[PDB]
Amino acid sequence: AKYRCGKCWKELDDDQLKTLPGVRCPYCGYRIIYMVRKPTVKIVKAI
């Protein structure tokens, strides 16, 4: 799984293999991270 450290809408991306004592951003230590949207192509009907 690919996450994203959330200090704003976008920050540095981190992945699941980075194992730590708990859930935290490795680069800045923030305690809230968010899942990114997978690159699968999505079809939306334009009605």
Residues that bind Zn ion (CB under 5 A): 5, 11, 25, 27-28
Site for another protein in 14-43 (CB under 8 A): 31-32, 34-37
* 1 binds, options another protein, Zn ion, none, Cβ within 5 to 8 A by partner type: none
CB atoms within 10 A of CB 13: 12
Q: How many H helices and E strands in the chain?
A: 0, 3
Q: Taking Cα atoms as reference points, which of 13, 4, 5 lies closest to residue 29?
A: 5
Binding residues: 5, 8, 25, 28
Q: Which residues bind another protein (CB under 8 A)?
A: 4, 6, 8-10, 31-32, 34-37
